[PDB]
Amino acid sequence: LAPPYRVILHNDNFNKREYVVQVLMKVIPGMTVDNAVNIMQEAHINGLAVVIVCAQADAEQHCMQLRGNGLLSSVEPDG
Template sequence: TAQPRALPPLPAGRGAAVTVSAHAGIWMAPTAPGPGGGVLDRPTVVPGRDSEFDLTPAKKKKKPRNYRVILHNDDNNRREYVVQVLLKVIDGMTMDDAIQVMSEAHQYGKAVCIVCPQPDAEGYCESLRSQGLISSIEPDGGKDD
């Protein structure tokens, strides 16, 4: 029977030699002496960094910032019309919500219609304006009303 032969040892600190069975042509996995086998080397690049020389903290993915769609009071549109436009333009707005937003804008000068990602907020704002209402957007969590 053919005896397994040992290949030359790996460079220092790299584990034990790999054995080869001449009879079956099987490569044996490298093992370290003692129980438990070898230990894998640590990767040189930390996950979240571009290279081993990149010392900036790992970048976290930011959630898109939300924006408030603001309805401003005006003296040109009747309250009933404002409620109709809010129901037509703002997705998911109920009659009670529309009346509340209209009343708040009338009483305080402005009211938040909806809080949503910036592209949606811009679309709602433009739709309200196209119906003759005064609206704007601002970052959520920014300045207080």
């Protein structure tokens, strides 16, 4: 199977913390409100936070819906 990739969430200064959480659970399979608030907290604290690690194609897709809902997210290889 395919290499693992990291979906990165970078701080954004436009959408507010609650919507961020809304998006995370909206697009990410298995995403809880508990996990999403941590991600927001950690991305806001460090500038970036790991959203999920998944096969590359699945990662690219979830990164797409994130960007399309207005959040700034990057993909990088899990290494």
